[PDB]
Write a protein that binds this ligand. Structure first.
Ligand SMILES: CCC[C@H](NC(=O)CCC(=O)O)C(=O)O
Ligand SMILES: CCC[C@H](NC(=O)CCC(=O)O)C(=O)O
Ligand SMILES: CCC[C@H](NC(=O)CCC(=O)O)C(=O)O
Lengths: 332, 332, 332
């Protein structure tokens, strides 16, 4: 059974076919690939874009999406095996995934790490649990990676540059400020897709502490070798932006500080200058800027940068709808 | 771009055409005016009628409605310009409105005032923000005015009296009791539509403190002059009800006490007799009674008054569905 | 007007016709029995299966379901008559049921007892209130009985045994452990449907304190007399399981302790051995096991029992979808 957990699990040809079908769906939005079909959208965390695009995406293809939020409307779910369920969780994922499997044709799931222990969050328990027990394809709506975002980001870049071949472009994935430590998911996905597309990637971040988990640094290396791009870590702002064609910002908490954020606050707090402003975008080769959203103005990027015609954040967000309809159509 | 923020922004002919299309949709509920289309229903406050009628309204016209609740399922939204977003709001309306604009064909929004400062609530920031940044038509689902309610109220009166011309009817908008201070929105809308229809309007309320914001008292005066009706403020119960053809109740907090309700409790508390009962309805010319709902029995109106065949509250509520489908059809 | 509050209110022929239409819908899932129609699903408590199956059920028949949660998105509802509404409830069921009646074609409602007073919970106020004031058919989505579960349970048994005639089978409804006292609804429904089908029913429970309300024990007696089955209460585990063909587990709080659970904790706590494990299922005549779900593993039933091929819990859950589409089709 084929799922959509990570773009890394898919071949370049399949990914390419997906992006092309996404471009096609963008030209003809209404269809019947999901006629009479349905998808269960399971959200363990907030969402505006993902929830809306999937729900409309299912409607436009003749299907229906059922939105569930364990702990809110649906019963809380247990993922650990062989445990005694006398706590807060009412039912086990082994039952939930099989029950949903009898109702829907697809299951999407969103579950952010708990932030208490990266050693456990990095295992991707929820996503893997759904894929293991569900008899129908599973779609990652963001856990420790954000594959749907990757394709919406990629398509937006190919549209911008007028070509599917992004090789040669100087790509800069820069960490940015936020009063609190966030999930690395989007950052991990960005590095994965930028290198998979064969671009010259520079992971700009404050200190070595903010470097992404090895799993993704290695995925990137393997992608560079195969795609013909390059990987580079940097702690110097100006040099990174130098001649960049694309700038993707995202804030996240230093992995080494998981479960012990108190001593991390003072550190991230001394790097508020990482905010993307006009000066930094000026050093780029008339580069394009984007962010996965939700974005906090004058914190992650300035008003001017967001209002800039070089900001393709809205196009990328729109592409979530088209790229996701392509994933669903391919999974059924 | 045409929106539906207030009936005041629309001409009498357009309003008339809307009410007529609403009457038509009521005869033939299923259609295709919204086939393959969608609407984002953004709720910052509770709702039963508005949420249900819009969702069914979209379904019956071939479209789909996506229901969002910032702070609950979707991310919290910032509306102030040029502020530093390091607080509770995760993204700005400038992005949210443009993102939704790429997904849906219509955006409805409901946002009650904060009740801390009428000087700020009266600006209608949320509604104006959506209309300013959205590339698609915006619909007021109640903020400081409740335009959809107005048309559902109007149509229900025209049906009741068997004619679209309400001129000459004695209309009484009476304030009523409630343990807490409420939004003036419905009251402001009632005054606006009753005078716009050319009726003889009497705003009955406890003390001059409970008179509506000048903006609406002036809208009413302009409407009277043009529609051929009349406006009158009153603090005397029996005289107001005298020969009235229509009685519309609604409770609200005295504007002068916004942000300082403590000294208002004792005042509203000494006017519980404003409740609409059989005696007051007896003084009317066999008048009809209604309320926007949700209505608290034996507080705003008595059980007998609600069970009375003169209570057209349920018809008015039903009309929300028909009048709204007419607004959506006209906006797309 | 015909509703679906309890299977007890329906004749055997009607119930049979329902189960058969459910079997038919299972073979042909898409239809038009609810084309252009809609149903309001009112949830006062959590739900995953009921909410999902009804929503998909309505979609598959050409209709649309609007999901409401009073106190969350919709306004809180008052059910007591002639009370003064100055509390937390914003509107009365007399209005809510009539308003919904103008919007939808069907109303489903889920409302668990408050657990403070069984004398009041047993009256089934919410369900009866909806059925009394609504101009459209009402469907019990679980209050003090769970009729939709009953039919999904029944159909699953008829499929398992390859026949609609379950007479002769040894049916065991056993109470099981849970750290907290739960609703008796499912237990009451199980006893009602098992005896209505004419099986040899044994209500196995810890102490006489855990025997179900007389209303249901009497319904069972009347059903036994008519269906040709038998009823029996037991406090002995091994004897009950002896040669059973079906084992249905469910945990619930002792009725006599309603509103005073403190002294009940220690009692239920000394009966954790009621958990359904391999040993007990071994004493059965190769019996089938099921539960309504959500089920807490290694508390109500062990992992082995749930993973056992004799566990038909997932089939029963799937049947909720088919049996409910049959109820809606019959009510419209
Ligand atoms: C279908 C059963 C619904 C509900 N179940 C619960 O309340 C169990 C919840 C828990 O275990 O936390 C009940 O017992 O009536
Ligand atoms: C698409 C990004 C989702 C999420 N974002 C947040 O949690 C930011 C929320 C905030 O700024 O309050 C994240 O960082 O993974
Ligand atoms: C259609 C009216 C919506 C809202 N009503 C309330 O907030 C009343 C709620 C309550 O009585 O608790 C208002 O007054 O504007």
């Amino acid at each position: 059974l084929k799922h959509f957990l990570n773009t890394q699990d898919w071949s370049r040809a399949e990914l390419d076919a997906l992006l092309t079908q996404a471009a096609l769906f963008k030209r003809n939005k209404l269809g019947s690939e999901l006629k009479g079909k349905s998808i269960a959208l399971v959200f363990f965390n907030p969402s505006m874009r993902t929830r809306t695009s999937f729900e409309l995406g299912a409607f436009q293809l003749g299907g229906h999406a059922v939105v569930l939020q364990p702990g809110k409307d649906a019963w809380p779910i247990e993922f650990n095996l062989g445990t005694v369920m006398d706590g807060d969780t009412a039912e086990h994922i082994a039952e939930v995934a099989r029950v949903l499997g009898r109702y829907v044709d697809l299951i999407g799931v969103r579950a952010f790490p708990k932030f208490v222990d990266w050693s456990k969050d990095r295992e991707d328990q929820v996503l893997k649990s759904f894929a293991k027990y569900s008899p129908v394809p599973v779609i990652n709506m963001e856990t420790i990676t954000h594959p749907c975002q990757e394709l919406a980001h990629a398509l937006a870049l190919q549209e911008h540059f007028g070509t599917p071949d992004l090789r040669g472009k100087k790509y800069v994935l820069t960490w940015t400020y936020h009063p609190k430590p966030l999930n690395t998911a989007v950052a991990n996905s960005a590095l994965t897709i930028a290198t998979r597309m064969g671009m010259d990637v520079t992971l700009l971040c404050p200190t070595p502490d903010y470097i992404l988990d090895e799993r993704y640094m290695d995925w990137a290396a393997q992608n560079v070798a195969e795609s013909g791009g390059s990987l580079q870590v940097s702690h110097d702002i100006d040099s990174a932006y130098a001649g960049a064609d694309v700038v993707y910002a995202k804030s996240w908490g230093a992995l080494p500080f998981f479960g012990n954020w108190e001593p991390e606050k003072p550190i991230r707090d001394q790097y508020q200058h990482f905010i993307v402003d006009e000066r930094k975008m000026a050093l780029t080769n008339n580069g394009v800027f984007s962010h996965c959203l939700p974005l906090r103005r004058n914190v992650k990027a300035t008003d001017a940068v967001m209002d800039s015609p070089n900001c393709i954040a809205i196009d990328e967000a729109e592409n979530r709808l088209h790229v996701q309809k392509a994933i669903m159509a391919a999974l059924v």
